[PDB]
């Protein structure tokens, strides 16, 4: 039963970049998850005139992507099947820009340079116009670390936001990440849940989005939903990075299911007003063996196998952004 | 003059002379004071079609450049991205189409564009919404030069209504053809071309950079391959069969706007179909070394009529109709850029 964070109303017509002297800021967020995944490195950086920010997955050697993009509000640039980093940022469509600032750091940290970028829409849960430019984008590449990522309001997440049945219960999110390690295998999550939907819990408990202050609770949308219909009648963007080897259909296919798993911690999900996006990364170290058999069934170590482990790695990516 | 039976009775005049790319590790955006210049190609087009306005623009140490369709209206847009090898948006409503060299780093392009519609707007759908495709052009020139904000911008504020820069302009400045071999690679451009059939109004836009040819309504191939041993150009496929023979012994963007509304379902289909008919004019065409992608784009300001029959049959005056009427604009573009 977390505290509340409600947004409130926004106040549009407030100033945008041409207004401001813009000086990035690392972002730091609540706490840093330390994680070991050697080729990965993660830089996040805000503008505290926003407050809006970007973060980026910086994986110098090239990894192989697939992309699941799903519902009505997707704003996507490159969408390669093989990057060097992924660009995820506020701003709307204006946010795109952040990925291009990373190319930018890409070439003069240096055949292409391939960055992917996905954005929200955070303007309404601020008063300004602010939005990650291409000096945001080459600032966060430039305070890419390996094995560290801010959780909470930093980077892409200061201004996400959950629950929008009504503006009036709508709370602010954050980004989360969570890192496991099997054997060899590693799965990091990077999240930005800024979703129409609620974030829940394993229990099935509502603990972030639509929080109404007359009562101090939150509820499931669909209690919402199902009564209005009675009165009346008469986005989030994520990555998923492993370094299992999976062929082109192995990967779509896992990016499928990892997606689609969060509606479990994610709900409403995949609705007409979410653009939701998710990459999944690889970085083709580790072969899964040749034959499925463990001492735990017959089918057991396979990419289905992966991707469920995946998909509770990135619950409790939702679950960080939404503390 | 002649009974018309076949699209060649009814041409673009297209140089025979060859203007071939010549072999390509060279200096980047920062390396310039780079000034956006005003794209005018070879030759103007000039159109009627109020509510759309095009700009284009080039740095000449690419050379490389951005064109900038402007719809301030907005216009509701279908996407057919169809093969292997960049996009940015893709929305299905757009305010702009922008269509850059410079491969993903001209995507950059696109946010110059968005920019200054922000910019004009002095966040609430007033979000302006721009949806942007490149070429890779770097093999046909000696820099690493490519389309950047600034020259979204530039290209955004030479819009002008009615005209389009035929040629080596915006997008089109290193555009080639003809990739079976780079030695046989040829230089394209952009083009245009317009038609207006009693209220419809068809544009048709195209930066063509395939790995296949350009190819008129005779069949003759008129830009790509061409060999300077031989002084000709041919088809493609007869340097594949004699390859496979030897070996193995026993990206086109454009952009398609129109006035007719058309319903999101049938604006996508509307798509597939002009786009398709470009391996008339490019051939081969969608292969996996092609990224190709066309906007489908309508300002939604008249309906056809409720029935689709005509004197000239029971379905004739149709969305299909619409289709085959602007696959013809289409290459009439094609032969434009390749001209
Ligand atoms: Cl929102
Ligand atoms: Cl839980
Ligand atoms: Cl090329
Ligand atoms: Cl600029
Ligand atoms: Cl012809």
């Given at each position: 039963?977390?505290?509340?964070?409600?947004?409130?109303?926004?106040?549009?017509?407030?100033?945008?970049?041409?207004?401001?002297?813009?000086?990035?800021?690392?972002?730091?967020?609540?706490?840093?998850?330390?994680?070991?995944?050697?080729?990965?490195?993660?830089?996040?950086?805000?503008?505290?005139?926003?407050?809006?920010?970007?973060?980026?997955?910086?994986?110098?050697?090239?990894?192989?992507?697939?992309?699941?993009?799903?519902?009505?509000?997707?704003?996507?640039?490159?969408?390669?099947?093989?990057?060097?980093?992924?660009?995820?940022?506020?701003?709307?469509?204006?946010?795109?820009?952040?990925?291009?600032?990373?190319?930018?750091?890409?070439?003069?940290?240096?055949?292409?340079?391939?960055?992917?970028?996905?954005?929200?829409?955070?303007?309404?849960?601020?008063?300004?116009?602010?939005?990650?430019?291409?000096?945001?984008?080459?600032?966060?590449?430039?305070?890419?670390?390996?094995?560290?990522?801010?959780?909470?309001?930093?980077?892409?997440?200061?201004?996400?936001?959950?629950?929008?049945v009504?503006?009036?219960?709508?709370?602010?999110?954050?980004?989360?990440?969570?890192?496991?390690?099997?054997?060899?295998?590693?799965?990091?999550?990077?999240?930005?849940?800024?979703?129409?939907?609620?974030?829940?819990?394993?229990?099935?408990?509502?603990?972030?989005?639509?929080?109404?202050?007359?009562?101090?609770?939150?509820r499931?949308?669909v209690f919402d939903y199902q009564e209005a219909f009675a009165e009346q009648?008469?986005?989030?963007?994520?990555?998923?990075?492993?370094?299992?080897?999976?062929?082109?259909?192995?990967?779509?296919?896992?990016?499928?299911?990892?997606?689609?798993?969060?509606?479990?911690?994610?709900?409403?999900?995949?609705?007409?007003?979410?653009?939701?996006?998710?990459?999944?990364?690889?970085?083709?170290?580790?072969?899964?063996?040749?034959?499925?058999?463990?001492?735990?069934?017959?089918?057991?170590?396979?990419?289905?196998?992966?991707?469920?482990?995946?998909?509770?790695?990135?619950?409790?990516?939702?679950?960080?952004?939404?503390?």
């Amino acid at each position: 039963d977390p505290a509340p964070r409600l947004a409130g109303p926004p106040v549009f017509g407030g100033p945008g970049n041409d207004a401001f002297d813009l000086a990035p800021v690392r972002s730091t967020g609540r706490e840093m998850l330390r994680f070991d995944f050697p080729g990965v490195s993660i830089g996040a950086a805000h503008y505290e005139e926003g407050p809006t920010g970007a973060t980026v997955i910086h994986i110098p050697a090239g990894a192989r992507t697939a992309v699941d993009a799903r519902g009505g509000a997707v704003g996507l640039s490159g969408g390669y099947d093989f990057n060097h980093a992924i660009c995820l940022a506020g701003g709307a469509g204006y946010g795109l820009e952040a990925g291009a600032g990373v190319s930018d750091a890409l070439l003069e940290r240096l055949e292409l340079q391939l960055v992917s970028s996905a954005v929200i829409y955070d303007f309404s849960a601020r008063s300004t116009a602010v939005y990650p430019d291409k000096a945001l984008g080459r600032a966060a590449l430039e305070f890419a670390v390996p094995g560290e990522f801010p959780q909470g309001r930093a980077g892409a997440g200061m201004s996400a936001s959950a629950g929008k049945v009504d503006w009036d219960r709508t709370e602010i999110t954050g980004q989360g990440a969570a890192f496991r390690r099997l054997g060899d295998v590693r799965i990091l999550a990077v999240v930005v849940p800024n979703p129409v939907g609620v974030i829940v819990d394993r229990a099935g408990t509502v603990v972030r989005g639509n929080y109404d202050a007359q009562t101090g609770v939150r509820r499931h949308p669909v209690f919402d939903y199902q009564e209005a219909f009675a009165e009346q009648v008469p986005t989030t963007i994520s990555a998923i990075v492993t370094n299992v080897r999976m062929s082109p259909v192995e990967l779509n296919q896992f990016a499928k299911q990892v997606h689609s798993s969060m509606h479990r911690g994610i709900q409403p999900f995949h609705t007409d007003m979410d653009g939701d996006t998710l990459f999944a990364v690889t970085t083709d170290e580790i072969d899964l063996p040749t034959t499925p058999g463990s001492s735990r069934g017959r089918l057991s170590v396979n990419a289905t196998a992966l991707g469920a482990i995946a998909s509770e790695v990135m619950w409790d990516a939702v679950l960080e952004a939404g503390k």
